[PDB]
Design a protein around this ligand. Structure first.
Ligand SMILES: *[C@@H]1O[C@H](CO)[C@@H](O[C@@H]2O[C@H](CO)[C@@H](O[C@@H]3O[C@H](CO)[C@@H](O)[C@H](O[C@H]4O[C@H](CO)[C@@H](O)[C@H](O)[C@@H]4O)[C@@H]3O)[C@H](O)[C@H]2NC(C)=O)[C@H](O)[C@H]1NC(C)=O
Ligand SMILES: *[C@@H]1O[C@H](CO)[C@@H](O[C@@H]2O[C@H](CO)[C@@H](O[C@@H]3O[C@H](CO)[C@@H](O)[C@H](O[C@H]4O[C@H](CO)[C@@H](O)[C@H](O)[C@@H]4O)[C@@H]3O)[C@H](O)[C@H]2NC(C)=O)[C@H](O)[C@H]1NC(C)=O
Ligand SMILES: *[C@@H]1O[C@H](CO)[C@@H](O[C@@H]2O[C@H](CO)[C@@H](O[C@@H]3O[C@H](CO)[C@@H](O)[C@H](O[C@H]4O[C@H](CO)[C@@H](O)[C@H](O)[C@@H]4O)[C@@H]3O)[C@H](O)[C@H]2NC(C)=O)[C@H](O)[C@H]1NC(C)=O
Ligand code: NAG
Ligand code: NAG
Ligand code: NAG
Ligand code: GD
Ligand code: GD
Ligand code: GD
Lengths: 330, 330, 330
């Protein structure tokens, strides 16, 4: 009747429409197993006082040569050369500057944490004096990295990203490079959301940009881009219709006030032996943008069990539907 | 009756048999937290014109020394030595070869993307002329990597793989090396699907092979093996019965026509200072096989809530069972 | 009645109390997408016969400079210098020691697997003789790493850990550094479970320790710490209440008898060119502690579908509740 039939049709609408055709309640799910390969192409040019006219290619600016699922691109740096294990004068810092040996306590760390103080106080320059430490010497100088960044050419760098996934449960496998697409295209390809959406080759600047940030800006102090690949698939539909979605997100905090060590930089070195048999190194403090490819899928496919489950839920629900509807009238 | 009792027994069979004892509908689930360590043992020998009789050990052929959860094995290479930052003649390519300086536009990239053109056109050889670029010099030569691959000895290399997992929800922990197994065995152990299934030490060639590929073949141009470890566990049963399953899959596309940059290769370098204080490097373009250990578990254990849920679903379902069965007769 | 009303109230208690307010059956779930950055600060000092008074900073002791989501800290090492590709005498091992060339079969591997035997037998020392091999020479000596470990200063090292997460389904994002916390605090901050629970800067020793292990002990042979971050969130509640939980677990087996290659060590090298144009390297076998940051969240939020589902389950269940209760009396 008005109470029974109406309510019945209503719950029908709820399940079929809402829980089923809408929310896919008739499906069983699986999540993604994933493998990512990246390849960066490009060259940066630098001109520098104390350096020269210089090329930086993929071996120079990718560090290390591979991280599984992510790559770090060198954008900026501070470079200290001809360091050797020795003693030298600490950089002036309130705690660094010293009048005499009383101020320098041997065996203790330093403000920077780049040396160990020999109690001896030594003169930094003709004007100053500061604690002597044992370290790689001379110490890196306290300075900000250059603005604009030395490796700015990197905005123009390109990264091929190959990603293959599989859903173990459903035995389905797919590649992020789709069947239609041909090799030559992929010689000349560059990803474009409008023109070339199926091109796996992305431009560094375009990723930053696409994330509503700017390469050059972000490139002085460094930072972290997430490149998110999403495989959501209804495996009832054509395999063809199962495709990756790319989104881009800057991961690190731009707020200088709520964090520590903003941007992205790390120290790493190059070691040489001067022919004497004596070791010397070059310390680089690099900044850049780490890119994290991040892949997450979910697939789903028709299954009796959950279907029937939901149905039973509906049937049990209508019982209460009649009461709730009845007492709802006047 | 014939309608009621029969249907009742039928749905009983469906739930108990199908949704429960079959499909495990009485269980609650958790997924794996995982840690992987790998250790490669072996030595490769090479003999080469322009090189010599040479050894390559783990420090030489694993690059870099560690990636979390995966390792790259060096199989092939192209090696350019005594490069220094300088200018030189580009390699002949349709765009490379030049008659005069008009053809070379200063400040622009090159076909390879290994240099920046100074507008000056310089003669490659007595016969040819091509654009001058600033780069690490001399340039790597355009050539294919050697066939058969230099590091073929790597087929015979061995990798210990230790994998420890935990299911946070169920508090259960396990190691991929099982309790029975003893240390000496693990001195001499090599994984065998027939004889030694519980041996964590796998042979590179055997992984490739087990994946229905061939090391040597795959080793010229490089590539990617997935080593898949699966922990599916019914935590109702003995902990003893919770074990890893190993499968092996080549991840990259063998089709040359549907992709870019087939196989696996990357560039990386060794930097030296000639005693003058002058820098020089050796560029290696390596090929090899990256191995991705990929671990995915699911554990499940009895829970009242889902059990009862399913039951209710059944009871609600039978109501419709009577109607559907009745109207199904004649 | 006594049968009907009582049972009704009982199942009500079961669902509302147990399946709902207790077990959160009214919620829908999502799991974590995660990004981790780590930064190690500190300096180690070493004094050694055959070495000197020496500093080791972050470039020296972090290897390689970055792994995505985990870092390896150098604690101990065995160091072999001025190796060059050449031939030399193998280390005495039952299989190593040889009386004459019959005992040395050319072209075959060795016990250590660091060389290839030229059939020639050569005298190790004035006293002994052993097989000649082609290798980097001289060979690393068979010895245990030093006790106590050279890099013990590392116990005192500190690691900033930044972790940003997002739940794609619920669009919620959060950082492991919380809004209240201010920069200066994070200059001086060190994580403390009692005093400073919201400090992202952890002390290596304190992590080991917190895991009921000891840095120094674990530091001779190396090993693996899991640093587990857990984001469990009810997204019904305040975003404020969504926070990370840190736990710490040693991942590797301390049992020497049930495994292979205990602790954590790997080989890696430094390559130099002696001015002749001749290559030489330094082989380091390092030990240390790899730290794996491991992040797993689950978020949940109210949803009609599962709520109603469970309800229906309840209603269907009570039907059986009446029978089970009735037949339960006398
Ligand atoms: C191998 O596969 C490629 C896959 O791209 C394919 O060539 C492409 O064919 C399609 C269909 O004709 C075209 O794609 C684009 O479609 C948009 C509309 O959505 C147009 O606005 C695009 O304009 C292009 O203009 C130029 C086309 O040459 C490009 O310089 C520019 O980047 C735009 O893409 C474009 O038409 C298009 O024709 C190409 N895509 C491109 C960029 O080449 C083809 O089937 C196969 N290639 C061959 C020749 O075997
Ligand atoms: C420590 O644990 C090891 C675990 O392997 C164990 O030694 C093993 O015992 C079992 C049971 O007797 C044996 O395993 C194998 O079983 C298959 C049948 O499924 C046989 O066909 C195998 O044939 C072997 O032949 C040789 C055995 O020495 C091997 O050269 C060869 O690789 C095959 O494995 C084999 O019998 C077997 O006896 C060993 N496994 C091996 C290979 O050693 C033992 O309990 C413990 N070790 C000790 C001595 O404490
Ligand atoms: C920016 O945020 C910081 C966040 O810590 C905050 O300063 C802190 O304020 C709280 C609240 O007064 C204090 O936290 C601690 O609370 C526990 C009790 O649970 C106390 O036992 C702690 O004792 C501290 O003693 C010293 C405090 O200076 C520390 O040396 C020691 O490590 C303990 O933390 C402590 O009171 C505390 O006052 C600080 N936390 C610390 C350690 O600084 C403040 O709101 C903001 N900072 C500023 C000044 O803007
Ligand atoms: C390296 O050791 C060699 C022998 O292999 C020795 O002749 C030479 O002196 C060493 N070079 C240096 C810098 O000590
Ligand atoms: C390195 O600097 C040292 C002082 O530490 C200096 O004496 C020497 O000239 C330098 N070596 C080179 C190659 O310039
Ligand atoms: C390196 O090559 C240069 C030319 O760029 C050459 O003059 C020099 O001999 C080489 N150095 C060595 C050690 O052979
Ligand atoms: Gd710009
Ligand atoms: Gd073969
Ligand atoms: Gd201690």
């Amino acid at each position: 009747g008005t109470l029974n039939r109406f309510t019945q049709a209503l719950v029908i609408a709820y399940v079929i429409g809402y829980v089923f055709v809408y929310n896919k309640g008739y499906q069983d799910t699986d999540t993604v197993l994933s493998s990512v390969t990246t390849k960066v192409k490009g060259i940066a040019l630098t001109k520098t006082s104390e350096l020269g006219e210089r090329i930086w290619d993929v071996a120079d600016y990718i560090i290390p040569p591979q991280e599984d699922g992510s790559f770090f691109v060198l954008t900026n740096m501070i470079i200290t050369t001809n360091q050797t294990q020795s003693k030298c004068a600490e950089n002036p810092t309130p705690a660094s500057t010293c009048t005499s040996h009383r101020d320098c306590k041997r065996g203790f760390n330093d403000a920077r944490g780049d040396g160990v103080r020999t109690g001896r106080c030594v003169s930094y320059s003709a004007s100053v004096k500061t604690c002597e430490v044992l370290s790689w010497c001379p110490l890196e100088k306290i300075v900000d990295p250059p603005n604009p960044p030395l490796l700015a050419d990197a905005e123009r760098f390109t990264v091929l990203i190959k990603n293959n996934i599989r859903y173990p449960k459903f035995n389905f496998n797919k590649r992020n490079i789709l069947p239609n697409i041909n090799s030559s295209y992929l010689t000349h390809c560059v990803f474009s959301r409008k023109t070339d959406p199926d091109c796996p080759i992305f431009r560094l600047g375009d990723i930053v940009g696409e994330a509503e940030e700017d390469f050059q800006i972000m490139a002085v102090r460094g930072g972290v881009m997430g490149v998110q690949i999403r495989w959501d698939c209804d495996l009832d539909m054509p395999q063809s219709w199962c495709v990756p979605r790319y989104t881009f997100r800057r991961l690190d905090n731009k707020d200088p006030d709520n964090n520590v060590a903003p941007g992205y930089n790390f120290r790493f070195a190059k070691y040489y032996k001067n022919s004497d048999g004596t070791e010397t190194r070059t310390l680089i403090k690099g900044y850049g943008i780490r890119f994290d490819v991040m892949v997450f899928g979910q697939a789903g496919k028709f299954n009796i069990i959950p279907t029937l489950l939901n149905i039973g839920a509906g049937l049990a629900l209508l019982g209460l539907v009649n009461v709730i509807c009845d007492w709802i009238v006047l």
